[PDB]
Amino acid sequence: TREEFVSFKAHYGLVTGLCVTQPRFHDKKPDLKSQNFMLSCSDDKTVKLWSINVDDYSNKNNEEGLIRTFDGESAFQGIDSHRENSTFATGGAKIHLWDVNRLKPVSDLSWGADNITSLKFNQNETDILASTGSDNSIVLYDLRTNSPTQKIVQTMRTNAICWNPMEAFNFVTANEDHNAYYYDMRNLSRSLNVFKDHVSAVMDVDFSPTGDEIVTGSYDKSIRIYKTNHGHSREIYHTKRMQHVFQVKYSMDSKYIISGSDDGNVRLWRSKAWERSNVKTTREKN
Amino acid sequence: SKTRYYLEQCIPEMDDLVEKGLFTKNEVSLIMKKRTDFEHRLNSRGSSINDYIKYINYESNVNKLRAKRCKRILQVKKTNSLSDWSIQQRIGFIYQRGTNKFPQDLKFWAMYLNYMKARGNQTSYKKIHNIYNQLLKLHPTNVDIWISCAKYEYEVHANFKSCRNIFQNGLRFNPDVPKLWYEYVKFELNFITKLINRRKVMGLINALRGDIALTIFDVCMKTLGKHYINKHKGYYAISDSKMNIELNKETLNYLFSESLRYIKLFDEFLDLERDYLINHVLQFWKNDMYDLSLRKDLPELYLKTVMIDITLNIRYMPVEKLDIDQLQLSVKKYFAYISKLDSASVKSLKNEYRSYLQDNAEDDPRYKILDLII
């Protein structure tokens, strides 16, 4: 319908990270179908795990916001969640791993004294994750050994990681030199593709869920969508009202591109910009 | 045009069927001509089931000619080519297309079913169960669907568990038709005599009486009365004296006519306690539903109930010497009923007279008892 379920004034300062969760408490069947949980870490040294009374099912007929709060001694910058066992991870002045059952960081994880600008879990081999620090550095962590496991330093600062849903050991870094880098994981010395055609800092990126077409949104007022095995722009989307587009993500059916800008608005786009989204008779399909 | 897709789907079987020497191209082009016309008439607009029927008939006939020239020219039963399964699998494909396009007519549904039964040597009840399932879902109300399904999977598979399941399902979907209740009781006594004589076979070579039929008869009478009284008085329950009483006695009339049908084709079963179950039927018919059929109104039904109560013990044959031994209960019942009824005394007397006239040196004491009854 293109409107919100609910909205909240979450934190005092900026919100710097938020994800969604299917939590598991040890004292509840967590009903992940009548209500829906997100969470967010922010600038005011707090992480908040939040409920949403969603209306998609009709199994029932109330506990709207802020089911619990986590408190950290320094600020926070990034969030993502291990997509099993309700363990999520935050980038702040140091990267902390914690689950939703205890109000303390279950692990410190950093290399040394450098903040963690973003991070992202994996979609498969979910125990592994990556992060990007303001040392212009990519650091991979493995939570089985509960340890960081390799770091590379690049020239300019990596804005945002996103893993591959299909390849599962390839990710994409978007950094501030004006190109995104399709890295491997097992051989981190050759960034096995470079998607080049931008003019300013590339703010985030994610894959299509079909795993072969990625989308970068950059600090110039334009997003663009890349094929995986080319390295140049398949297509450029821009409009006059969008400006300094910061967070672009790919909807879970590989059809729409959600672009949240800096002027406030969040927009929908098609991925294949010429196709249309109705069912087609087989002569049209052919 | 998907007709081109079907028409060049059918090319490789005729390719192999020509390159082995049973047809020539000068006539496989003719059958391709007629197949082209049939496919066009089929998936054109405004088509019909008769077009599907003629396509099925033509493909079965060219299948039979294929087998005929196979055993004539090649002198074998089959040539293990692609064709031998292909022609009947596309017959089944035509059947599937016709059921999807026209799920109305049970004639085409039924001959799909009959062809799959006759192929049932090779093919599967895994395939049969699916088409019975979707036919059952498209027609829940039609009772012959459930009856033919039960007849098939009890008179080939004999799976009494599934037959009980689908009869309970059919009565769940419509507990209104008398025929489904009737044939549920028919299957019940069928397998009850089957396993009585099965344990008789076990007893030869080496509890479960009609209480099930009693229970389903009782719920049959209750549900049938509820559904007749709801079939009448369509939208609004009419509230007066005489129309309310007439509707209750009309329901009782139709219900007890149905229990009379239950009795009169219940006595076909001889391998069970037929008299005890007919006694249970009359005992359930004794106490009434807001009408009191015996002493109050429906006196003709009370008279037929009394005559059935006498004849349920008087069920005998021409060789009636054991009836001459055990007709004391008959004379006692006729006396105790003539001592109750007023003009049904005359009716029951004439009825027992005609029944004894149907019953009639061994004729000599029988003539004595005949003068006693007269």
Binding site: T1, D56, N59, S277, V279 | Q104, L138, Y235
Partner: protein
């Protein structure tokens, strides 16, 4: 993930499988909201897989009541557990698309292996299948939907409002508008019997003037051959004896006896019509004693039926004010103010025996005593 939907129709329930899923993000687009108006591209979404009609119209009204109160009925239970596949433990919970969040939890309780969806997408393809309707079934039904919901609508309205079956002036208005007309035409036909039998008895018409006794004795004496008795003639009735003498002294008469039998059948036809009258009149005397007993006791059955006919209906007569109970002919200065008194008394009586659901007579009696004590000034 919308695998099945349940559509509730006047003739019975239908359950559709969903072949292709509609698009979820672009659901407010023109090219998606037009494919639920194109039928040949709506059938690429939705396949009919079951349709159980209601057995009787009483069960149709019962299912309409149970859906309107959001309950599950037994035919609905039957079609749901026939069509919906049983799932495993919690993986792949099967999914209906129903039309209301109140029918949601009830079938969730009846089927814990079934999940119910009623969002914009569910209501979208629900209204698609409602729009196309009977074209989906391709004749697989016994019923036409507009006339079926006509009957179901009047039934559901009547059962919701508890509209009475006896409290009904529609008998009485056409009953009185029937009997005045047939009084007129039996007068016509008796005059025609009179002028026809004047060719056989030109003298009897002045001696026996009454219509019913006239026709009943015309059925008695066919030809002028009475000649002997007075007993049966007085039983049809001295005047008998004068008619007997004038049958042989009048003689200003033809015979036409070979086809006077049509006059014999015609006079008894007038007899049967005039005897259907007074038993219709007895019927509506009882019907005004049962429907509007205060009106029948205050003003009488004839003026009561004329009043509710001349007003149009009983409720219209009641909701009429006391001054607009003016009429012509009925309500039999010193007559004017007592006519006004009787007028607003009978309007009040009409209000009583209309809006009372099962009226009594005692208030009609006290109104009668009031108006007679009022006119007793004279």
């Amino acid at each position: 993930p919308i695998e099945y939907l349940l559509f509730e129709e006047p003739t019975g329930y239908a359950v559709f499988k969903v072949k292709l899923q509609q698009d979820d993000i672009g659901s407010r687009l023109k090219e998606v909201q037009e494919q639920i108006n194109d039928f040949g591209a709506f059938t690429k979404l939705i396949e009919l897989v079951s349709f159980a009609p209601f057995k009787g119209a009483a069960e149709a009204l019962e299912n309409a009541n149970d859906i309107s109160e959001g309950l599950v009925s037994e035919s609905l239970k039957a079609i749901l557990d026939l069509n919906l596949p049983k799932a495993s433990s919690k993986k792949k919970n099967i999914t209906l698309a129903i039309s209301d969040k109140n029918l949601g939890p009830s079938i969730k309780e009846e089927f814990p292996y079934v999940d119910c969806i009623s969002n914009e997408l569910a209501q979208d393809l629900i209204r698609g299948v409602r729009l196309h309707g009977e074209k989906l079934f391709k004749g697989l039904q016994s019923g036409d939907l507009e006339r079926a919901q006509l009957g179901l609508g009047h039934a559901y309205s009547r059962a919701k409002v508890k509209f009475s079956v006896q409290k009904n002036d529609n008998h009485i208005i056409q009953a009185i508008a029937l009997l005045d007309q047939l009084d007129k035409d039996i007068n016509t036909f008796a005059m025609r019997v009179k002028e026809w039998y004047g060719w056989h008895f030109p003298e009897l018409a002045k001696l026996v003037p009454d219509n019913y006794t006239f026709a009943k004795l015309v059925l008695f004496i066919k030809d002028k051959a009475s000649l002997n008795d007075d007993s049966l003639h007085d039983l049809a009735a001295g005047i008998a004896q004068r008619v007997i003498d004038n049958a042989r002294i009048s003689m200003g008469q033809d015979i036409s006896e070979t086809d006077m039998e049509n006059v014999c059948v015609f006079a008894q036809r007038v007899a049967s019509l005039a005897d259907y009258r007074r038993q219709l009149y007895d019927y509506l005397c009882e019907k005004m004693h049962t429907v509007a007993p205060n009106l029948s006791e205050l003003i009488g059955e004839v003026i009561g039926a004329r009043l509710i006919s001349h007003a149009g209906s009983l409720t219209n007569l009641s909701k009429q004010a006391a001054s607009t109970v003016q009429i012509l002919g009925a309500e039999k200065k010193n007559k004017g103010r007592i006519s006004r008194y009787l007028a607003n008394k009978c309007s009040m009586a009409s209000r009583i025996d209309n809006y009372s659901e099962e009226p009594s007579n005692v208030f009609g009696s006290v109104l009668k005593k009031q108006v007679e004590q009022r006119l007793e000034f004279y």
